[PDB]
Design a protein that fits this description.
One of its GO terms (molecular function) is phosphatase activity. With about 170 residues, this protein is of the alpha/beta class. It has six helices and six strands, in the order E-H-H-E-H-E-H-H-E-H-E-E.
Length: about 170
């Protein structure tokens, strides 16, 4: 099943090293510009989007009218929302980097987060474009055995649940 995963553009925290999960931050001006550059480049397939502003705005500027689904949200960082990555306790830092054994205090466990992401993908009946977040893209790419680092405002097409098809930046 061909699925396009679009990581939303830049927000202030994405450029200042701060964890951004459920905090509803808007895209910066460049973040909006990154979204507009996607219009015409992404296939005009049915679109779904996280209900967070930054994702919805990316979908809109990319020329799509997505159906909103909370299951596509970034992981909730709870007490670590906005947390300065620099002073972030090594325990959480190491956990996020390895992508396991991570449950930000007050937020969602990585296991719960990944379960809702993969469950959402299972409900898709045809190719679609998903306006989502870095954590979501990473979870999907890691499951396929590949690096989940994709530039903000870029997209990766995958043939779920087998391999990566193409990385559009």
């Amino acid at each position: 099943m061909e699925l396009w995963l679009v990581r939303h553009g830049e927000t202030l925290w994405n450029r200042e090293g701060r964890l951004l999960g459920w905090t509803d931050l808007p895209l910066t001006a460049e973040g909006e510009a990154q979204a507009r550059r996607l219009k015409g480049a992404l296939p005009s397939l049915p679109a779904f989007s996280s209900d967070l502003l930054r994702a919805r705005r990316t979908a809109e500027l990319a020329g799509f009218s997505p159906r909103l689904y909370p299951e596509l949200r970034e992981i909730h960082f709870g007490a670590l929302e906005g947390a300065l990555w620099e002073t972030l306790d090594p325990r959480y830092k190491e956990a996020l980097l390895r992508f396991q054994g991570f449950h930000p205090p007050g937020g969602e466990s990585l296991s719960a987060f990944q379960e809702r992401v993969f469950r959402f993908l299972e409900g898709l009946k045809a190719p679609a474009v998903l306006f989502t977040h870095g954590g979501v893209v990473r979870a999907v790419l890691r499951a396929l055995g590949e690096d989940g680092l994709v530039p903000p405002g870029s997209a990766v097409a995958v043939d779920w649940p087998r391999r990566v098809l193409v990385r559009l930046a």
